[PDB]
Write a protein that holds these residues in place. Sequence first.
Motif, short mmCIF file in Angstrom:
data_model
loop_
_atom_site.label_atom_id
_atom_site.label_comp_id
_atom_site.label_asym_id
_atom_site.label_seq_id
_atom_site.Cartn_x
_atom_site.Cartn_y
_atom_site.Cartn_z
N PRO A 163 0.83 -1.20 0.00
CA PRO A 163 0.00 0.00 0.00
C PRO A 163 0.86 1.25 0.00
O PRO A 163 1.95 1.27 0.60
CB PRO A 163 -0.81 -0.13 1.30
CG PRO A 163 0.03 -0.99 2.18
CD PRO A 163 0.72 -1.96 1.26
N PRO A 164 0.42 2.32 -0.67
CA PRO A 164 1.24 3.54 -0.74
C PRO A 164 1.29 4.30 0.58
O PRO A 164 0.95 5.49 0.62
CB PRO A 164 0.55 4.36 -1.83
CG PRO A 164 -0.34 3.40 -2.56
CD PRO A 164 -0.76 2.40 -1.54
N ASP A 165 1.71 3.63 1.65
CA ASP A 165 1.86 4.29 2.94
C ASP A 165 3.25 4.03 3.51
O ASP A 165 3.78 4.85 4.26
CB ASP A 165 0.78 3.81 3.92
CG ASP A 165 0.93 2.34 4.27
OD1 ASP A 165 1.46 1.58 3.44
OD2 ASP A 165 0.50 1.95 5.38
N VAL A 166 3.84 2.90 3.14
CA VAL A 166 5.18 2.55 3.59
C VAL A 166 6.18 2.94 2.51
O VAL A 166 7.33 3.30 2.80
CB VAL A 166 5.28 1.05 3.94
CG1 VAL A 166 4.87 0.18 2.75
CG2 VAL A 166 6.68 0.69 4.42
N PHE A 167 5.76 2.88 1.25
CA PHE A 167 6.59 3.25 0.11
C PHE A 167 6.21 4.67 -0.30
O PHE A 167 5.33 4.88 -1.14
CB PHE A 167 6.42 2.26 -1.04
CG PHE A 167 6.81 0.85 -0.69
CD1 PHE A 167 7.77 0.60 0.27
CD2 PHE A 167 6.22 -0.22 -1.33
CE1 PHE A 167 8.13 -0.69 0.59
CE2 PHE A 167 6.57 -1.52 -1.02
CZ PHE A 167 7.53 -1.75 -0.05
N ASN A 168 6.87 5.65 0.30
CA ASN A 168 6.58 7.06 0.05
C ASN A 168 7.51 7.68 -0.99
O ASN A 168 7.57 8.92 -1.08
CB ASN A 168 6.65 7.85 1.36
CG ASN A 168 5.62 7.39 2.37
OD1 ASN A 168 4.64 6.73 2.02
ND2 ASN A 168 5.82 7.76 3.63
N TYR A 169 8.22 6.87 -1.77
CA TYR A 169 9.07 7.38 -2.83
C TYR A 169 8.94 6.62 -4.14
O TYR A 169 9.40 7.12 -5.17
CB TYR A 169 10.54 7.36 -2.39
CG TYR A 169 11.38 8.45 -3.02
CD1 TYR A 169 11.43 9.73 -2.47
CD2 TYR A 169 12.14 8.21 -4.16
CE1 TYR A 169 12.19 10.73 -3.03
CE2 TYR A 169 12.91 9.20 -4.73
CZ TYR A 169 12.93 10.46 -4.17
OH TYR A 169 13.69 11.45 -4.74
#
Lengths: 277, 235, 236, 286
Positions: free
Chosen positions: B212-218
């Motif tokens: 989910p796009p919450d841990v991968f912020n790049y």
Amino acid sequence: VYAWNRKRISNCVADYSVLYNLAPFFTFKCYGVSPTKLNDLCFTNVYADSFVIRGDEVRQIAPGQTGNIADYNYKLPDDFTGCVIAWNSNKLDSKVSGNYNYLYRLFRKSNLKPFERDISTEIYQAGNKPCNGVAGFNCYFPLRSYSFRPTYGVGHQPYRVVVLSFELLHAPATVCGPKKSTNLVKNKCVNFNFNGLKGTGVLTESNKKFLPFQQFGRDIADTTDAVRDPQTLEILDITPCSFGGVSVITPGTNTSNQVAVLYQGVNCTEVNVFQTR
Amino acid sequence: VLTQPPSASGTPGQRVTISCSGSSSNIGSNTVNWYQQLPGTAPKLLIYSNNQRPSGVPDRFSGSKSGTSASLAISGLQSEDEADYYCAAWDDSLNWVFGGGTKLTVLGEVQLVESGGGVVQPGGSLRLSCAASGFRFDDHAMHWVRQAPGKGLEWVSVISGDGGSTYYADSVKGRFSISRDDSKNSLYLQMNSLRTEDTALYYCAKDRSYGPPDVFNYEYGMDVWGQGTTVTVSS
Amino acid sequence: VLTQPPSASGSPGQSVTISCTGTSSDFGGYNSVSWYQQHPGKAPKLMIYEVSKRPSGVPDRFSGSKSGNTASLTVSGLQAEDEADYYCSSYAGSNNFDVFGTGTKVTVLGGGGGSEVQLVESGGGLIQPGGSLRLSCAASGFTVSSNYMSWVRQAPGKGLEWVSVIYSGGSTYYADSVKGRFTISRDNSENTLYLQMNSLRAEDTAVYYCARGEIQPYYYYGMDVWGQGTTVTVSS
Amino acid sequence: LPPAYTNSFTRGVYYPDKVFRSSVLHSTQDLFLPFFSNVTWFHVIFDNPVLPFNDGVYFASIEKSNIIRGWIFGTTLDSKTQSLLIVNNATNVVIKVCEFQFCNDPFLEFRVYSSANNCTFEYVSQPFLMQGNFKNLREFVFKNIDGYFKIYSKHTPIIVREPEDLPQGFSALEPLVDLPIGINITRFQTLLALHRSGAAAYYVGYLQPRTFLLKYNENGTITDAVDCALDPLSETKCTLKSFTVEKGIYQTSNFRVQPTESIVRFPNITNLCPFDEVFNATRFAS
């Protein structure tokens, strides 16, 4: 994850903006502060802790969380002011020859203290038996290797995760951040902020012989007159800006209205025109 | 919330600068994403992570993240660059806030098609389906970015490639159920408590990340879009 | 949700070769697909944990190679009299329960763990709907406080599914079925380890099974020992 | 050893800050060595005592080539607290604040300590800090503040071959290292390069908070310095910004005799309380 580096780095200009272009990172979350304001905050020493986990385990690296790796190999309390910078490394750390080099310490007795490295290799003893070294039915290898293969998908790939722990103890801060500079302007009243020394004046060239250790410079009675250039050695002179008293000469409001303006302390080239003492 | 010029202008030959202002909770802690959408066709990714560009996007576009705001730069624009520009960023409160759109008008291979629309009875609704053709659905995420006719775009829900935790928007939370199956490339989205304010397209957006796009912020972005159906409940 | 054949009876012991499709991936990370022989009555028994290296048991069931995207467990030439249900385990993603499959009737004919460590339960006869009932699996052998155990229940007709997972000392993850209404509480560290019902929602009627080892992240653990379950028989 | 004592002449006036001054008189107030004081005469002809570091010391060295090298500054010289082991090895200087307690004795090969603990600074200074009848005098002013362990130094090639004693002449010290490490230091330990396989004698003074009027040269260096509390003439030379006092009488600061004893006399003790009769009876109450 069981033997992670603890490099204590200090005495450097930590430019966090450069880290945005070194390698194609996939995670740049910072819990403490913002990266824009991070470049203007001094620190004593940064603790660099790196490790390699899978893609599905990156979410376990959080300031307080349970899991097979969050409480068995590396734990972060609710005070981490650094970042969780990480990136995928499935380009040079995955070959088809058997990846029996890593481990994650599947077996453990209890949760370890956060920010602690336990480099142990003893056989896991599951109580109710004295295990002086044996492998069967009561005591097994507490370490188990991964299964990283090149022909796999994202989520179970080697992800290099590196955290930068910050601390501020009762010691002066060493690492602050990058500092910029501007072009020098000569023979012009401008502002200057040479190493904290703020003010205004005309930066001119002097012929003073400063000592190799002296940086600033004052006058007879508490006034800065010349400082050393923070760049390559150059002897300048700091004279105050243009100022003077204005006097108006008037022959009286009974014959005419023509007046004369006299500026004190000027050579007619810093404001008919006449120059007097 | 993201501040963006509603309808800017520009002249050919020179360059313009589209900006997007946001607080430090969404832009200051994440990366801004720029999307380009031609009038009539499906949108497409323009600039992701503010540093890299897709293979289809030429060098005619560039972006920066100076401070807490994003800045777009199009060196040498032409008539082909007349499209809508939307800003997107993932906020730390488990949400995806989108932009408003920039009317930059100047007067001189895997298919992701989905369906499952149609007018239905108010109150209730049907399921939203999607499909593809060999794009490694397990190693990619999917987004629901609907677009009302004439209005802007907004994020509805997100599903990760692993198939575990999912997040919803502030208005579609609870009454929506998104999930996948062990069958071929597909995506099922169930809608409940229809309040008749759902006249949009519900694009089956394809992503490139895994979680989910919450841990991968790049690395979070959005791949090529897909032709969506026009569902108009109209009460 | 996995894909398993409803039944398998044609060509007994010659071309059965049951498997479990529906993966569409490379089994995540560690490729460890286990096979459980769910027999009516006593608790099921482990048959094989990896693709090879079968444990101490029947030697006529091996060669469980992963053909394509599924583990094809070679069962041909085993025997011609069996009445049980085979279940496979996969989908080893992080925090993903329901790793078991549907009921596969592998009866080749149809018609025709006890004293290892310990086996005890609570015996929940005529469970009142709600309340709080505790079920324990006190083991006088292996430590009931250091090894990684779990709880898996099964209902008549439906297959098994992960209900509870508890690590060594600092993890109390719960399944998605309870979503929070289930609270695991460990008993004394040297006596036993029990569970807690915590106001069941009429879905906890299925029989329980307290296993000494994990299911999806299964380790050798010397031997796989199970325990017989008890019927809840709710009266909601 | 029975440590002797010598008369410390005018020596040890360092630069308090880095400010260029030309032909002025700056009256500074900081920790300096009082003129005409007593300094121990520890001879290194064996000697290694423990010296108390209250607020700053004045270290000297008249070694020939490599006799006196290294410093063992620290608080307790134990493994619990940190310490300082700044030594002078072959054309380099190693500066570490690690908590290396000791191994057997402060002697020196790194035979000074043998252990391994956590460190805080590894600033290895590459530039080293260190003629028949031509010795060499090396003075070092050690001053510690809340956030800086400032160390001064100066190398003067003395010429006179008189008996070992402090020479006559003003000589300031130039700062070279400004280690910002913060650690409490209270003990001073010295050591010499043994190398077994009247040589030299170090002087160790003590700094005191006093006032000194500095005279800066036209180049920017200090030519001499005069104390303010040493004699009735120094106070006159400090109260007026001039080292050449004219003929006459000048009013210096005032004096005040501080009291010694303190008496507190109160009125006589009388009018006692009946508590003595209250707490002594047979039938008290119910």
